[PDB]
């Protein structure tokens, strides 16, 4: 199934994935296509940030769902 990710330039890219794919697998495909290291990407869907270790089916992500990619501004 094909999902969408909104990138850091606000453009929509496609990803070919399966429901059993883990979040890390999805991030690896985003790295392959966009170049962003997995350890800096965060994916937001329906307000919940997707968590490493869980799968797309856990979040009811389906064909044509859009994920929002962001990165971090750390402070302390």
């Amino acid at each position: 199934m094909q999902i969408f990710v909104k990138t850091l330039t606000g453009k929509t890219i496609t990803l070919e994935v399966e429901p059993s794919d883990t979040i890390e697998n999805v991030k690896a495909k985003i790295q392959d296509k966009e170049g962003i290291p997995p350890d800096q990407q965060r994916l937001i869907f329906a307000g919940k940030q997707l968590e490493d270790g869980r799968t797309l089916s856990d979040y009811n992500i389906q064909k044509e769902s859009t994920l929002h990619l962001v990165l971090r501004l750390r402070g302390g």
Partner: protein, 564 residues
């Protein structure tokens, strides 16, 4: 405080958490909901909602900065996580989800979505085929693109702007395979509370790493949003008021967070910087966080707004409804009140202290420089008592000390033992002195006596010097006795004493007093009928000094002449 509200203690690198906590604390409808969560059988160590109830309770009731110590512990964090620098919006997405799930099965269930959840549509049209797809999704925030846009208006325009699904991003229409398509997004619902995340980062190909975008980006005070809805509403326009500005100073993965708010919703802004709340001006919360100032380069360059919080004009009253103690359940107030009492039992592991440099006046009436280490969130009594076990106490004496604020060698007031150390003036002009109260000034007679300020000066009333001191004066006393006391307080030679002169001083104007008329009357040392934050009149001593000196300045000096 100086503002009504108080801040939060920093554990090490918890400024993002303090900022976000203040943001949610002034979401009054959410605070009222959090108070109502069932935490009666919950363990303090493992209850996120209960820890949130504690932080909210203390932020409402206390007037000293609030610790978030238990809050990170309930997250399951060790103390190594208390020095982690994190993203405030990431913490928002995790905390709000965790609490929304914990509110499920309770009475305030669905509160977070009612306040933050919105809906949007993703329309997809194929360019070469009759295939139109339709997808409705939820969201709790909006990631607005920053680079190349001038203000929020342009960034919302670009968000709903139609994008092209071309080349390697062809649309999988299933039947017709990958097709060239057009993707568009429109808004169906804008929640009562709008969290906007400014996408302040990009990939820099020159350094092969991600970079914070410190360019200029304007956000309006009033936000019109009916332009970007699919179906509008003439009876309820999507008009928003700015409620919070989360500012981030610094690097991509390091820096410091601050939060600006107008909690009441009226326009009276104030700044929350960890354990310090301080009023400010609307221009400091808005215009000065557009940022993208690359000139005169200091922190300002990478200091700019990161997260914006708007509230719908028509929802301002329900979201910011006032919170009394009739909104707080009994068992929570008593859980926390009876929770503190177990701490009057318990030397090690203290604390985020500050260094306090001041003058210590001894029993022999001479000065000693001393630097103490009190709790930054402690009071004056803590500082005085901290002094008592760092000095000699006199063999026997009053044993009670006092703190004086001295500007220009005059005592301009005594500080009560209640005053919090944070509210002491940090100005350069101020010098604080701790001295032991003399015996005749401990329990002084109110009707007849009074403690007056004495200071030295030299022929000009503003040319003050030496060491000021407090002197007890008795009603109707003959002045030769007051001089008798003053002399027993300086202890220099008898010869220098008759040279003295004595005067009453008020507002630069001064009147000398007769040493032989003996006229002591308390009415002469009292202000103008109405004034007390007006300089207290004081008694001045006129004579010559013993003072330190400084180098000779030449390297070509002095004169001026035009020879022709």
């Amino acid at each position: 405080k100086h503002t009504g509200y108080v801040g939060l203690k920093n554990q090490g690198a918890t400024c993002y958490m303090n900022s976000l906590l203040q943001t949610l604390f002034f979401t009054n409808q959410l605070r009222k909901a959090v108070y109502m969560m069932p935490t009666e059988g919950d363990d303090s160590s493992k209850s996120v909602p209960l820890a949130l109830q504690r932080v909210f309770y203390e932020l409402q009731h206390s007037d000293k900065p609030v610790g978030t110590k238990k809050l990170t512990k309930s997250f399951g964090w060790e103390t190594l996580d208390s020095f982690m620098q994190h993203d405030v919006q990431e913490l928002c997405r995790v905390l709000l989800d965790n609490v929304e799930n914990k509110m499920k099965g309770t009475c305030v269930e669905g509160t977070i979505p009612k306040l933050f959840r919105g809906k949007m549509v993703s329309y997809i049209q194929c360019k070469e085929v009759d295939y139109r797809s339709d997808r409705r999704e939820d969201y709790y925030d909006i990631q607005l693109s920053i680079k190349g846009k001038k203000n929020i208006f342009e960034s919302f325009v670009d968000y709903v702007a139609v994008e092209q699904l071309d080349g390697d991003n062809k649309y999988d229409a299933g039947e017709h395979g990958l097709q060239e398509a057009e993707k568009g997004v429109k808004f169906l619902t804008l929640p009562p509370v709008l969290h906007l995340q400014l996408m302040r980062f990009m990939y820099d190909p020159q350094t092969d790493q991600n970079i914070k975008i410190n360019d200029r980006f304007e956000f309006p005070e009033q936000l019109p949003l009916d332009e970007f809805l699919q179906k509008t509403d003439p009876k309820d326009p999507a008009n928003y008021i700015l409620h919070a500005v989360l500012v981030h100073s610094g690097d991509n993965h390091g820096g410091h967070y601050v939060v600006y708010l107008n909690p009441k919703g009226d326009g009276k802004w104030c700044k929350f910087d960890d354990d310090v709340v301080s009023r400010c001006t609307k221009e400091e919360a808005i215009e000065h966080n557009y940022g993208g100032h690359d000139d005169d380069l200091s922190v300002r360059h990478c200091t700019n707004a990161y997260m914006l919080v708007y509230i719908r004009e028509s929802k301002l009253s329900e979201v910011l409804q006032a919170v009394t103690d009739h909104d707080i359940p009994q068992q929570l107030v008593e859980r926390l009140q009876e929770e503190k009492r177990i701490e009057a039992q318990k030397i090690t592991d203290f604390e985020n202290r500050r260094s306090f440099k001041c003058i210590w006046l001894n029993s022999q009436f001479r000065e000693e420089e001393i630097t103490l280490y009190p709790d930054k969130h402690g009071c004056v009594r803590d500082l005085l008592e901290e002094c008592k076990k760092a000095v000699e106490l006199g063999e026997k004496a009053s044993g009670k000390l006092r703190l004086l604020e001295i500007v220009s060698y005059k005592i301009i007031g005594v500080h009560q033992e209640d005053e919090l150390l944070e509210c002491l003036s940090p100005a350069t002009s101020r010098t604080f002195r701790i001295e032991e109260i003399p015996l005749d000034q401990v329990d002084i007679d109110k009707e007849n006596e009074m403690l007056v300020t004495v200071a030295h000066f030299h022929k000009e009333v503003f040319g003050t010097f030496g060491i000021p001191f407090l002197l007890r004066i008795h009603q109707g006393e003959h002045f030769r006795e007051v001089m008798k006391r003053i002399q027993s307080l300086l202890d220099i030679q008898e010869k220098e004493f008759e040279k003295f002169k004595f005067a009453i001083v008020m507002m630069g104007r001064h009147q000398y007093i007769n040493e032989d008329e003996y006229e002591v009357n308390l009415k002469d040392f009292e202000p103008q009928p109405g004034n007390m934050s007006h300089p207290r009149p004081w008694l001045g001593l006129d004579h010559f000094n013993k003072a330190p000196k400084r180098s000779r300045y030449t390297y070509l000096e002095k004169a001026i002449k035009i020879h022709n």
